[PDB]
Design a protein around this nucleic acid. Sequence first.
RNA 1: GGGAUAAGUGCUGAAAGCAUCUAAGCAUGAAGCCCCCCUCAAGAUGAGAUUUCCCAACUUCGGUUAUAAGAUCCCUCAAAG
RNA 2: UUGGCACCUCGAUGUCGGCUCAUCGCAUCCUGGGGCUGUAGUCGGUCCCAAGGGUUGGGCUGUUCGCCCAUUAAAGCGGUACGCGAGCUGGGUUCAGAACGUCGUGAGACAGUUCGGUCCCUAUCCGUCGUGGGCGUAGGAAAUUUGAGAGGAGCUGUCCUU
Lengths: 37, 144, 216, 176
Amino acid sequence: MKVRPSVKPICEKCKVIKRKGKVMVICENPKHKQRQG
Amino acid sequence: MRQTFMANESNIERKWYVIDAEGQTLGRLSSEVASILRGKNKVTYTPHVDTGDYVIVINASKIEFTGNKETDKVYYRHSNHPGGIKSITAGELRRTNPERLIENSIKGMLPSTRLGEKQGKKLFVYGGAEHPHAAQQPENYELR
Amino acid sequence: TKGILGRKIGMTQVFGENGELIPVTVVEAKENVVLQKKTVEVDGYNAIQVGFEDKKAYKKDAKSNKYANKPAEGHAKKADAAPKRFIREFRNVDVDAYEVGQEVSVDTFVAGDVIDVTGVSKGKGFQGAIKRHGQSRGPMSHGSHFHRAPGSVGMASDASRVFKGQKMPGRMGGNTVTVQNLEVVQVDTENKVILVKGNVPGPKKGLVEIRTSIKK
Amino acid sequence: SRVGKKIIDIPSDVTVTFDGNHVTVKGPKGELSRTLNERMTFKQEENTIEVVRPSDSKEDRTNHGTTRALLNNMVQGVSQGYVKVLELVGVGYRAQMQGKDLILNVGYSHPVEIKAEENITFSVEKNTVVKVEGISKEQVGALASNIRSVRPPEPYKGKGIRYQGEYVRRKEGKTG
RNA sequence: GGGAUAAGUGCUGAAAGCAUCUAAGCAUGAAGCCCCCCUCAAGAUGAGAUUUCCCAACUUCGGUUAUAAGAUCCCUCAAAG
RNA sequence: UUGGCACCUCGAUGUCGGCUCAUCGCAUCCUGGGGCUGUAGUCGGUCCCAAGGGUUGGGCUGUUCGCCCAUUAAAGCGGUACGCGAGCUGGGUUCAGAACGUCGUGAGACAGUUCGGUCCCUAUCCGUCGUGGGCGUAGGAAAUUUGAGAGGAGCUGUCCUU
Ligand SMILES: [Mg+2]
Ligand SMILES: [Mg+2]
Ligand SMILES: [Mg+2]
Ligand SMILES: [Mg+2]
Ligand SMILES: [Mg+2]
Ligand SMILES: [Mg+2]
Ligand SMILES: [Mg+2]
Ligand SMILES: [Mg+2]
Ligand SMILES: [Mg+2]
Ligand SMILES: [Mg+2]
Ligand SMILES: [Zn+2]
């Protein structure tokens, strides 16, 4: 999980979602998992 | 010419009311009850004497909050021991001690004076629909 | 779950089955009687009240606690028993297994039972921080004028006070203490004594309460 | 909400009955009851049901979609049921039935027991293919998730418990 | 050991025909939180509860009285100080 | 932290280090729970949650630091008048003596050095630790008690088996 203020797609398969009030990126590639913070 | 009536213990008549917390918002019920307890609805209101009425609150366990207060309104207290902060959420308190929840909300709206304490002592809160004060013959009171 | 009251007699030792030396406390637990039976219906909780160690009967001009007063005599005669020196409740037992008036013999416990023992620890009187709280001394030499003092009691302007819980000189001992997970080494029904493994709080002749250990 | 607008087909053998918000569906395999959103109306046709939302607000659209989906899931669960299939990978990784419960031996020093739940049936094939069958799609998914979480697939050899169709990313464990 | 959680892990699931741990709903998840364990504790003035004991005369008939049960003074003491 | 400012205190707010006693924050050193890994395993890296508890003896130096020896699960970082001198010490440092180098014609001087060199106070109030008396608790008493609250505790190694 990448926790950082700048959450955004890294590849075309990254998907920006919002869970529990937090912007996140979910992807088939586990390296690209992000959570805003 | 001085002519203002002053209530005193010889001419004060305190009634008993019952108020149903079910489906009511905590703070709004609380402000109204505080008015009743202080006697602010009486035309003989006299600041230096207790002209208020007794209130029984039933169904305290059915009081409701708006927003996310159930998990986000936190009651803190301190035991006067170093590091002695203890907290409880409003929802948890409603589950485990609704009487205290209502009591504390109402008593936070009464002055921190000797008379204020006395007036707050006229409040009776019960989580269920029954109260043990049929002897006092209380009347139902409709909010607002 | 079981319970009984006795007097601390003293310590001694027994040789175990492999010759291991077992220090033991001898507890004399004669004259235990169920005086009262408390229930959720009447009292709000279940418990048996046990009276231990008969005292003498009421007499007109009694001057000591050796003779029961009239309230105590009435309470005991309700159970049909002689008045008792010590009375304690056991909530850990099953009330339905007891009758008021019933004897509680040392035989309720068996060798191997793991038990909690509760007593009042020996009194020490007014004691200082080293003894009472196990604090460190200051230097005994090198110019020191600090040997047995308790040390700094706060900080400075913040907080301009001493916090509750500061450890200071004062009365030591005489406190309720429970030692958990002791063991019943032996029961001697002829002498009404229980040999408990290890040591228990309190002076000799002191009241001790033995219960089935809460942890298991 | 297209899902909300979409109508639910009821097989002739399946009966849906509403009690205010609460609904219950009976069918050949079992009965499923739950409480739906109180603000959704239901047009109960003889052979089909339709969900209707009061407004076009965000909340109403979300709840309309989810309500339709949940009710259709109940109907299809009573009619055909739901099944989830997991498989075991790894030499010595086996499963078996201890009556109704399922005991798994997956590389641990102890077997792991999973106790069956109401309305759910476990079935082991070839000692390496577990399948959970039920009427509740949600229950089936939950229990399959628990089984699989007993030991999920590791990337270096695929060993562990996986859903039979699951794709497991693979890694080259050892390099010079 | 129990309950509720954190970061997480998911199930079911639409908004957004797909997807999605989340919006509704259902799980799981820390030496941490609330308990469980130990001690103090009803001046908890909201002063709680149970068992037992005592229970009359005189009165301006409001009330009083010494006595009761009980507890002390004083004295012999220690396991207490 | 080094500073800037000069707003409280010069009819005095004791100054370094140590000792005694702690207390709080979390930006976490260990232990507990996780995600990612250029994570095969054993180890690691990085990030997230987490402050319950734990977080060592010595050599040198006044020292704080720092280096070193030997340990440990780990040897955390900070605040509290760089916590704490009406609780202790007094080795450093800025009184009087003396001396070296240096500067100065000199008297003398030097965030240069060296040897020596007085640390007072019977606790009034709050505060804190113990321990009694009064009255209250709608009769007067003896015991047994519920538990609203509060405090305590909370750490971890190694080995065997699998
Ligand atoms: Mg970036
Ligand atoms: Mg020492
Ligand atoms: Mg001395
Ligand atoms: Mg002055
Ligand atoms: Mg943190
Ligand atoms: Mg200072
Ligand atoms: Mg300081
Ligand atoms: Mg000082
Ligand atoms: Mg000196
Ligand atoms: Mg010269
Ligand atoms: Zn991606």
